[PDB]
A paper describes a structure:
DSFs are a family of fatty acid AIs produced and detected by a wide range of gram-negative bacteria, including important pathogens. The [name] receptor [name] is conserved in numerous gram-negative bacteria, including, among others, Escherichia coli, B. cenocepacia, [name], Serratia marcescens, Yersinia enterocolitica, and Enterobacter cloacae.
These data suggested that RpfRCt([name]) copurified with a tightly bound fatty acid likely originating from the E. coli overexpression host. At the other end of the pocket, the [name]:0 hydrophobic acyl tail is surrounded by conserved hydrophobic residues. While [name]:0 is an inactive isomer of BDSF, the RpfRCt([name])–[name]:0 structure provided the first insight into how fatty acids interact with [name] and proved to be important for comparative analysis. Comparison of the RpfRCt([name])–BDSF and RpfRCt([name])–[name]:0 structures reveals that the ligands adopt different conformations, resulting from the absence or presence of the cis-2 double bond in [name]:0 or BDSF, respectively. This interaction cannot occur for the fully saturated [name]:0 and would be significantly weaker for trans-2 dodecenonic acid because its Cβ would be suboptimally positioned further away from N202.
Numbering used by the authors: 116 to 206, 213 to 224
Write the structure that this text describes.
């Protein structure tokens, strides 16, 4: 393998359903992209409190959002890890979430 990425890159629709899920996301979670496409990111990867906040953010973003950053605790194969997500529309029906593990 020539190189590796440094970010967890997840693309979502307005419902939080997953459209793409990169290799580092697979490494953190133990789940393959093919296993998670169409699945809901909030219920799959967040505690109830984080999911509720995150779902409201995404729904609000699709209404009138500008690109933004947020910190989210995420359930991984070694417990919860904190990520900075840089979120923006595709250059709109999909949201690109560009995450760094900031734990
Ligand atoms: C480790 C990969 C799995 C986590 C992907 C989560 C997507 C984050 C969406 C955050 C939106 C928000 O809370 O404002």
């Amino acid at each position: 393998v020539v190189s590796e990425a440094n970010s967890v890159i997840v693309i979502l629709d307005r419902h939080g359903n997953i459209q793409r899920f990169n290799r580092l996301s697979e490494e953190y979670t133990g789940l393959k992209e093919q296993e998670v496409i169409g699945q809901n990111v909030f219920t799959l990867f967040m505690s109830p409190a984080e999911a509720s906040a995150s779902r409201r953010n995404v729904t609000g973003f699709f209404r009138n959002g500008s690109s933004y950053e947020v910190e989210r605790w995420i359930k991984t194969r070694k417990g919860q890890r904190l990520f900075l997500f840089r979120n923006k529309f595709v250059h709109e029906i999909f949201l690109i979430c560009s995450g760094t593990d900031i734990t």
